[PDB]
Amino acid sequence: TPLLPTTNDGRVTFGEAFNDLKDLARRYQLYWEGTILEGNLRAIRRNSALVQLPLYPHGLRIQPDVNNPIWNIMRDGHIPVISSGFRYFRGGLRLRIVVEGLNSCVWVQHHPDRPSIFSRPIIGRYIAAKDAYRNHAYAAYVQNMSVNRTIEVEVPFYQPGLYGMLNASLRFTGLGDLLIGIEGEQPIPKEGIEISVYYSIADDFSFNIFCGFPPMVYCDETY
């Protein structure tokens, strides 16, 4: 048969190329979002952790529920879908943590030597005894929330294997917990605080051995 003349993956009609799934995975998408109320948090709380957020390239295990419907009807973004087709990865993440309703300082620490214990995030008090406060000498980043309410951080791949496991369930499979916390005495307002975490792939990231995609569901029959 005859072949259809090329447009260079779209550079001829639109202005740009679209030849890599790695490039679509570099556009941020919602990683996790939730609220933390004052009682839900810890009692003697002066330099303490607020969320312990396990870092997976394939995203968290989405709980679809009524009070935030981005997960019910959109399911998970383009990044969990592209990730399910591959077995391993070797890179870091890029995050954007937008923590609302808090006015002082928000330290963010990365614990690269921690096992991948949970598939959900741990809120407030329940955070384990040894991640409950800011540690020393871990890569951290403090941002005053009055100056800017958006934290842009890149988590590196600090982990000893040839790969990190995608599609997971020592157990050193990935790039361990990220920790978000307040830096001083604060008034935790009524209606708590909202944290939104967006993530994407970093420039030194990869997807490696392509097995098949798992069975999918269609968005169009969610209602």
């Binding site: 005859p2 003349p5 009609t13």
Partner: protein, 215 residues
């Protein structure tokens, strides 16, 4: 590298032996008694009305009968430049003027009915025709459309690239006596310049329908 080649991998089927000649289409007759400023003699979806000019007894156009429309029967996509000649028949004792212009995909503009006024027709590509000299006048209509190819059959409304207008610029005016005419005859010749058909199928695989008129 042109954008008609970016729509169809199959090459184009070009039969110049049976296209590319002046075909007669319609003749229309305008009166002294209803010829005012902005009278519409011809208001057609073009080239749909020309190619579907041949109708059944049950009024479905058949491409089969004119050797010019033989490729419109067996393809589904087509693209071509046109030329409309208008001939009016010279009667010396009358005077009047015709304006013929073409409006690319006119029928779907929100302000379509406002653009019929012959003042607005002097701004689109047009030609003027007298009854004395300036009998013939040929318009030119290159292919300009949203997509690089037009559909040839239904499933709505194939081959609708524009609207052709023929209106009364200066009214058909006569002498006040009986040897004067009551009307004249205006004949519209068409032809296709770069006819490219693609997507060759059977016939009887798609249908035509009784064509709809512009308001």
């Amino acid at each position: 590298p042109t954008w008609d080649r970016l729509a169809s991998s199959e090459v184009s089927d070009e039969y110049p032996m049976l296209t590319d000649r002046w075909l007669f289409w319609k003749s229309v007759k305008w009166e002294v008694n209803d010829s005012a400023f902005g009278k519409m003699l011809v208001q057609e979806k073009f080239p749909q009305s020309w190619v579907q000019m041949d109708v059944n007894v049950n009024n479905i156009p058949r491409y089969t009968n004119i050797p010019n429309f033989i490729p419109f029967n067996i393809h589904q996509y087509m693209r071509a430049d046109f030329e409309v000649k208008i001939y009016v028949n010279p009667n010396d004792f009358v005077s009047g003027w015709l304006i013929m212009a073409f409006l690319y995909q006119g029928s779907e503009m929100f302000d379509y009915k406002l653009r019929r006024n012959p003042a607005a027709l002097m701004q689109m590509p047009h030609v003027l025709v007298n009854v004395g000299a300036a009998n013939e006048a040929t318009l030119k209509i290159p292919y300009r459309y949203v997509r690089p190819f037009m559909r040839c059959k239904d499933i709505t409304e194939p081959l609708n690239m524009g609207v052709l207008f023929v209106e009364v610029l200066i009214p058909f005016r006569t002498s006040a006596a009986s040897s004067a005419p009551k009307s004249l005859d205006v004949s519209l010749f068409v032809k296709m310049t770069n006819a490219k058909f693609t997507g060759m199928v059977d016939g009887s695989i798609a249908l035509l329908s009784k064509p709809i008129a512009l308001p």
